Amino acid sequence: AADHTDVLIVGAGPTGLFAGFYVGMRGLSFRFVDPLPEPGGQLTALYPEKYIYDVAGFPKVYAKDLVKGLVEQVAPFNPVYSLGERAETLEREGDLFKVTTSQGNAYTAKAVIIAAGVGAFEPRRIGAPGEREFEGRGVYYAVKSKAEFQGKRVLIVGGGDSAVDWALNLLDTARRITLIHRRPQFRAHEASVKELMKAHEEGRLEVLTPYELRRVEGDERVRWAVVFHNQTQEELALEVDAVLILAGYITKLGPLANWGLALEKNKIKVDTTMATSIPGVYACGDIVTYPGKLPLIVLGFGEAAIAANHAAAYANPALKVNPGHSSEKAAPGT
Amino acid sequence: ADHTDVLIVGAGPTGLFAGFYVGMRGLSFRFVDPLPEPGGQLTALYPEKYIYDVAGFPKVYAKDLVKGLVEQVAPFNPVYSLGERAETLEREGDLFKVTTSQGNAYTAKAVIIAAGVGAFEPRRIGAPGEREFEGRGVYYAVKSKAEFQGKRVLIVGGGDSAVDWALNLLDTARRITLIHRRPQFRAHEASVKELMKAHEEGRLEVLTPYELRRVEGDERVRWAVVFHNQTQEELALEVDAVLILAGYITKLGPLANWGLALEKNKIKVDTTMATSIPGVYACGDIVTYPGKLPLIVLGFGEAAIAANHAAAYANPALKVNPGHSSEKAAPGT
Ligand SMILES: Cc1cc2nc3c(=O)[nH]c(=O)nc-3n(C[C@H](O)[C@H](O)[C@H](O)COP(=O)(O)OP(=O)(O)OC[C@H]3O[C@@H](n4cnc5c(N)ncnc54)[C@H](O)[C@@H]3O)c2cc1C
Ligand SMILES: Cc1cc2nc3c(=O)[nH]c(=O)nc-3n(C[C@H](O)[C@H](O)[C@H](O)COP(=O)(O)OP(=O)(O)OC[C@H]3O[C@@H](n4cnc5c(N)ncnc54)[C@H](O)[C@@H]3O)c2cc1C
């Protein structure tokens, strides 16, 4: 896979999404690359269920709903979402930039916007014997396709908003679902939770709390999983074909430290036009640093607007940086 | 009271958000703006239009974004000192003193300048008698309908404001005469059609392209002279009121006398949004730096930076970084 776009954006968190929106507003093509399986960054991975109060114009808005808003806002420009992939290398070849992903893919772009946040997200492991051994052979950390779980007996581990959703989404395809969580309350939206417990009572699936994963067993592939009551230590052996670990994602500075960027305390140094030390490469959001920089969504959006328009002008010299009043233009997409 | 921790010049979108954040840091604040309502350019210039590049809003009417910001600021009991313009900015020890066009004097520990492109003020025609009878028959806004109940009114202007009020006073005034210096009105198309319908029905006089020559009166307005700006033909109209709704203009004005380091009428700021004067921060269209763009979304970011740094300036016990709002109590309680 070597697709090309005018601009490639590292990170599909809130700032990356808005940057993509503006790149789209300037008439350019753009691709989002992020190891997280969906858009939203920290909002989606760490607190989708919580209200945010300091985003301009929203007296109150759920992190999950803000993401939905941003996704819908970028949609008219038909973005290319290359999620589930981490940007490993950033190289310049002639008039283009080449980025190779953790999936072996090689995308190119005329300009690059780095909205990497505090680092690349990756599934957190449970640490149970057999978990690591059977990864790829019955142990999963993401659902790439529901067919992968067709007629399968599945054990889902997790208590976050993501585990709740996948348990429900799979009732549609899995033979049997069993979900364990270390405590009674889930950190997911109340409605979704009520929907899950309803399915439990209906016998559509099985929810066990407070339970944790002791170990995964198999031969050539997963055959069983042993879970345990974290208080009484009583164990339960479940016959399963797959173990879907959805215990959240964690961040690591990662690859971006190897791109030859001017950094300061693991943050990307930028001037006021959001340009990094490398020409044609811009940044915005939690990943940048400058005097007065605050790790806030509201500032991240403003930084994205700046990065996107300067990157746009860099990728297409026929464009001025200032975009003009959106209110005086045709609705996005036309 | 007369004092607040921070005084914010301008109640536009960036001023409002800056106010919100100062509030979030537990400080008192006051907005000073000649406009009677908050909103700045969105309120004064394009309230009915959809905005598409405000983060998180696939589309939002300018007027609605303003009401969202006002509701967002509300819980921190803002002091809305609207209807007055900041004329002077002085510092006495550890206080900043601001006197307004209304003779008032306000004080604060820190100031945020969110002046946009200048102070808004109704556009004047410049006709003899216009300024003379202002407040005695000549108006630049509609306080209420009863103000024009049963009166003969000459309305001047060709935008949404002039057209809407001419239509909205038809059942209030004894007679309305609407004039505009251009042949065509430039208000919403639906409004223009309604105006033409009312005119065709004989509900009011509409004269274009006409202008105000002069306003006459004794202790109040009694007559007005208007003229066709092509044929130069004049017409004397017997009226009890002259309602001028010809739009707004902005004036850098007093801001050029505050001692701030400017650059082409714009306030120079560093990345923390501090101006050349310690204790004075700025944000929005009024500031300048490489890469600055006249966008609302960027103005909000600049306002967050100025509000938090201004707050730390007013209360040195506060850390500039406010921390996550989502991990604190909802605004207000
Ligand atoms: C619990 C919590 C509560 C918060 N509450 C608030 C609040 O109320 N208000 C507020 O303003 N802020 C809040 N924040 C901060 C806010 O979440 C961040 O400011 C915001 O997420 C930054 O957005 P971003 O797009 O810059 O980066 P992020 O959302 O962090 O997204 C960066 C993305 O880029 C990806 N990425 C990184 N490196 C690579 C690579 N090499 N290749 C590909 N992809 C990569 C990541 O996987 C990630 O998805 C909170 C944070 C937390 C943890
Ligand atoms: C999608 C989009 C569409 C846009 N469309 C338009 C458009 O159609 N037309 C347009 O003109 N702009 C447009 N803009 C620009 C936008 O309106 C401005 O960027 C924004 O209004 C700036 O906000 P502000 O708070 O900095 O200042 P402003 O909204 O200009 O507000 C400044 C306020 O401070 C007050 N003030 C100034 N000096 C003083 C003083 N000395 N004492 C007291 N009060 C004072 C003013 O009276 C005013 O109310 C658009 C922007 C975007 C992102």
Swiss-Prot record, chain A:
Cofactor, how bound (note): Binds 1 FAD per subunit.
EC number from the UniProt entry: 1.18.1.2
Enzyme class, first EC level, given as a word: oxidoreductase
InterPro entries attached to this UniProt entry: FAD/NAD-bd_sf (IPR036188), FAD/NAD-binding_dom (IPR023753), Fd--NADP_Rdtase_type_2 (IPR022890), Ferredoxin-NADP_redctase_2 (IPR050097)
Cofactor list: FAD
Matches recorded under Pfam families: Pyr_redox_2 (PF07992)
Residues bound to FAD: 15, 34, 42, 47, 87, 121, 286, 327
Catalysed reactions listed for this entry: 2 reduced [2Fe-2S]-[ferredoxin] + NADP(+) + H(+) = 2 oxidized [2Fe-2S]-[ferredoxin] + NADPH
Any one GO molecular function term: ferredoxin-NADP+ reductase activity
Protein family (similarity comment): Belongs to the ferredoxin--NADP reductase type 2 family.
Assembly and interaction partners: Homodimer.
Protein name: Ferredoxin--NADP reductase
Organism: Thermus thermophilus (strain ATCC 27634 / DSM 579 / HB8)
